[PDB]
Each structure stands twice: as structure tokens, then as C-alpha cells.
């Protein structure tokens, strides 16, 4: 059987919490008044939800309304509990209300308003300084939820809202989030395929907060190397092959040997052998302005097969990549 694994930080935070903190199934949903909101314009969507800019008529304030489709609606208690637990934390989206549409029986989550800057245009414009600044903002959100015994499990650009005018960031869409309990075996079918950590791709269920740190490295790699997504797999097996063509197979087999992981028996024909690529092969004239030895050293410390060997969110914040960021 596989060798067990525990987080190297915030391991015991949920054991010292009363059961009401993490036992989301026992939480009672206090439903607000849906007549308190007027839908103004669509901001965007997801496979799980329809997102709108709205007005809260009880205080004439702009709000964000997330209408949950049945897939997202199934896990509402867990999403609500996690949002309530993290409310007020650094760069965490603020849940303002929970409502239901009498006509369709569909629920919706109401959030604080975020004046979001263009998604497909933020990726193209952020300077070297901006990337460092915003990465540090994400790390504040990640260290916070991890410290509160929660794994986001869906870190990607679509789940990060940026108000570039006010240089404000929010870590959003906590629908896939989970409470970390040491020794617990989690479902690996979490997050987008592109941002999945190798622990998920190899069916290593006993994962932890470090999964978010892999996803954060995928984001950074994509940004500095101007390749979106950075690991573009066709399916879950191929996703690991894409990772292996950059990180090499040798470190991958050391990882599976360390935890005694069993791969599919056709593993040698699917994965084969691949050498570790040097980060310099991804550095060209058009992206060299985003690359520094500190960016590469930081990246290398996030994109590690061994989930126990990646920087934690707090250690990532001490990295020299962030020295030039005004604090
Ligand atoms: C149909 C949209 C919807 C979906 C899920 C939950 C609530 C509502 C809703 C229902 C009614 C109103 C009031 N409109 C004015 C506002 C809203 Cl936000
Ligand atoms: C390559 C990603 C990245 C790497 C390093 C630093 C920042 C970012 C980033 C982070 C976030 C965004 C903006 N993403 C917007 C996501 C979004 N907008 C929405 C609007 C409505 C509903 C959901 C929504 N999700 C853009 C970017 Cl470029
Ligand atoms: C049943 C335990 C077992 C005993 C002996 C040999 C293999 C397995 C096994 C163990 C796990 C799985 C499913 N997980 C496969 C993970 C995986 N992802 C890959 C991506 C690329 C290449 C191989 C890959 N294998 C399938 C299997 Cl068959």
C-alpha cells in the first residue's frame, strides 16, 4: 500500500476546532431575501455557475451574485461553511448573503463587489513588478486559508479576481475547497486538469495544502514564459506526461518510489523516459523581461513532484523574488 503523508504545517488546526467549524453537513442554511437584489449585467460564468453584477436595494450597494447550477448547488453547505470560516481573511472574497429563487429553486451566493479588470487582458499587460506584487497577494490568501485548515483545491487564473485600479486581489470560487484532516484520503478529481498536482494525477489521495502551491507554480510558469496553460494535457494521464516532458521522468519515479505509489501497469509505454528541461529553454526575447534568477529559483521550489518538498505559502512569502515588492 502507499506510504501515508501529513502536511508539514497547520497539521492539527482542525482537531483543536469544535466540530461545528469543519462539519459543514450539520450547518443550517440561513436564507436571505432574494427580492433584496436586482440583476444589472453578466460579469461572467463557469461550468458550475452564472455570475452577475447586482444592486442590494436595502442599501443601494453593488454586489456580486453567483447563481449555482445543480452540480455547484450539491456542495453549497461546504462552500458556505468555508466562506463563513474565511470571511474577513486577507484577499478572501466576502460572502454577504445566501438566497434562493422561489421559481426555479436554484440557490445563489451574494458577495462584496469586486471591480474586476479584463481577464484575457490582465495576462497580456502585467509587468514583472505587477506579477511579483499580485503573486504575493495570492500567497496572503493561501497562507490564510491553509492556516485556517482549508485547501482551496482549485487555484487558477479564473479563480483570482483583480481590481487593477485599486491594486486589490480576491481569491474566489471556494466550491471545490476542503477541510484538511491529517491521514484523510481525498477525492483526486479536483481542480482543472491543467493545474492539478502530480499527487492527483497518480491517485495519491492523502494530499494537503501543498496541492495549492503546485497550482500556484503552474500560474507563475504560464505568466513568465507566456504559455497558457503551461502544462496542457489532453486528459489526466497525458497531463502527467506533459509535466514529465519538462520536469523529467527521473524525479517522477523517485517520487512514486518514496510513497510506494502504484501507477497504471502500462506506465513505461505512456510515460517513457524524459530528461529534466532547463528553465532557460523557455526564455526568449519576448518574455526575458519577466524572467530573473529569483523568478526561476521560486518557480523551481513550487513545481516539485514531491508535495512535501514544495515551499509552503509562508515560506514562499520569504523568497527573494518578493524583495523588490513594497510591503
Ligand atoms: C432568478 C435569479 C435568482 C437565481 C438564484 C437565486 C436567486 C435569484 C433571484 C431571484 C429574484 C430576484 C429579484 N429580481 C428583481 C433576484 C435574484 Cl438574485
Ligand atoms: C496567468 C495568471 C496570473 C499569473 C500571475 C499573476 C497574476 C495572474 C492573473 C490572475 C488573475 C487574473 C484575472 N482573472 C479573472 C478571473 C475571473 N474573472 C471573472 C469574472 C466573472 C466571473 C468569474 C470570473 N473569474 C489575471 C491574471 Cl494575468
Ligand atoms: C489496484 C492497485 C494496483 C496494484 C498493482 C499494480 C497497479 C495497481 C493500480 C494502482 C492504481 C491505479 C489507478 N491509478 C493510476 C495512476 C496513473 N496515472 C498515470 C499517468 C501516466 C502514466 C501512468 C499512470 N498511472 C491502477 C492500478 Cl491497476
Provide the phi-psi class of 88: left if phi over 0, else alpha when psi is between -120 and 50, else beta. Answer: left
Residue 80: φ, ψ to 5° = -65, -50
Residue 111 DSSP one-character state: E
Report the nearest-CA residue for atom 5 of ligand 3: 262
Return the residue whose CA atom lies nearest to atom 23 of ligand 2: 44
**Same domain? 109 vs 120:** no
175: which DSSP letter? T
One domain, residues 193 and 51: no
Strand-by-strand arrangement of the 37-45 sheet = 37-45, 49-56, 61-68, 107-112, 95-100
Last residue of one domain, picked from the residues 113, 147, 162: 113
CA within 13 Å, CB half, 235: 2
Resolution, expressed in angstroms to one decimal: 2.0
**DSSP track, 33-63:** -GGGEEEEEEEEE-SSEEEEEEEETTTTEEE
Residue 143 annotated in active site: no
Rounded distance, CA 326 to CA 317, Å?
A: 13
Identify the H or E element spanning 163: strand 160-163
3-state class (DSSP) for residue 64: strand
Which helix or strand (DSSP H or E) is residue 269 part of?
helix 267-270
- Range of the structural domain that residue 285 is part of: 5-22+114-327
- Return the ∠ at Cα 302 (arms to 146 and 315), rounded to 5°: 55
- Structural contact between residues 229 and 246, judged by C-beta atoms closer than 8 angstroms: no
| Cβ contact 138:145 at 8 Å | no
Crossing angle (nearest 10°) for helices 293-300 and 210-224: 150
Q: Tell which atom from ligand 1 comes closest to the C-alpha of 100.
A: 6
The cell numbers describing 87, all together, are 470571511
Q: Are residues 206 and 285 in the same domain?
A: yes
- 69 and 193 together in one domain: no
Nearest CA to ligand 3 atom 2: 262
- Phi-psi region for residue 2, left (φ > 0), alpha (ψ -120 to 50) or beta? beta
For the beta carbon of residue 19, count every other beta carbon within 10 angstroms: 8
Considering the domain architecture, whether residues 100 and 222 belong to the same structural domain is answered as no
Q: Answer yes or no: are the C-beta atoms of 79 and 177 closer than 8 Å.
A: yes
Q: Name residues contacting ligand 3 (CB within 6 A).
A: 201-203, 237, 240, 262-265, 267, 270-271
Centre of ligand 3 from the C-alpha of residue 265, in Å: 6
- Binding-site members are 43-51, 66
Q: How many domains does the chain have?
A: 2
DSSP type of residue 8: S
Amino acid at each position: 500500500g502507499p506510504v501515508p503523508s501529513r502536511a508539514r504545517v497547520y497539521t492539527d488546526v482542525n482537531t483543536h476546532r469544535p466540530s461545528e467549524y469543519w462539519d459543514y453537513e450539520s450547518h443550517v442554511v440561513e436564507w436571505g431575501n432574494q427580492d433584496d437584489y436586482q440583476l444589472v449585467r453578466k460579469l461572467g460564468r463557469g461550468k458550475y455557475s452564472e455570475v452577475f453584477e447586482a444592486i442590494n436595494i436595502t442599501n443601494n450597494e453593488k454586489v456580486v451574485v453567483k447563481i449555482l447550477k445543480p452540480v455547484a448547488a450539491a456542495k453549497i453547505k461546504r462552500e458556505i461553511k468555508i466562506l463563513e470560516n474565511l470571511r474577513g481573511g486577507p484577499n478572501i472574497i466576502t460572502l454577504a448573503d445566501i438566497v434562493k429563487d422561489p421559481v426555479s429553486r436554484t440557490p445563489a451566493l451574494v458577495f462584496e463587489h469586486v471591480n474586476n479588470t479584463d481577464f484575457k487582458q490582465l495576462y497580456q499587460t502585467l509587468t514583472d513588478y505587477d506579477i511579483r506584487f499580485y503573486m504575493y497577494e495570492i500567497l496572503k490568501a493561501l497562507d490564510y486559508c491553509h492556516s485556517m485548515g482549508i485547501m482551496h483545491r482549485d487555484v487558477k487564473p479564473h479563480n483570482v479576481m483583480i481590481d487593477h485600479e485599486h491594486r486589490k486581489l480576491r481569491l474566489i470560487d471556494w466550491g471545490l475547497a476542503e477541510f484538511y484532516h491529517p491521514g484523510q484520503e481525498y477525492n483526486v478529481r479536483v481542480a482543472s486538469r491543467y493545474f492539478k498536482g502530480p499527487e492527483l494525477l497518480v491517485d495519491y489521495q492523502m494530499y494537503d495544502y501543498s496541492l495549492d502551491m503546485w497550482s500556484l507554480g503552474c500560474m507563475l510558469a504560464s505568466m513568465i514564459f507566456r504559455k497558457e496553460p503551461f502544462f496542457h494535457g489532453h486528459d489526466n494521464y497525458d497531463q502527467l506526461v506533459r509535466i514529465a516532458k519538462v520536469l523529467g521522468t527521473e524525479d517522477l519515479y523517485d517520487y512514486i518510489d518514496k510513497y510506494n505509489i502504484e501507477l497504471d501497469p502500462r506506465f513505461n509505454d505512456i510515460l517513457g523516459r524524459h530528461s529534466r528541461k532547463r528553465w532557460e529553454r523557455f526564455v526568449h526575447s519576448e518574455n526575458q523581461h519577466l524572467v530573473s534568477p529569483e523568478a526561476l529559483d521560486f518557480l523551481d521550489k513550487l513545481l516539485r513532484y514531491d508535495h512535501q518538498s514544495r515551499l509552503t505559502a509562508r515560506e514562499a512569502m520569504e523568497h527573494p523574488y518578493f524583495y523588490t515588492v513594497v510591503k
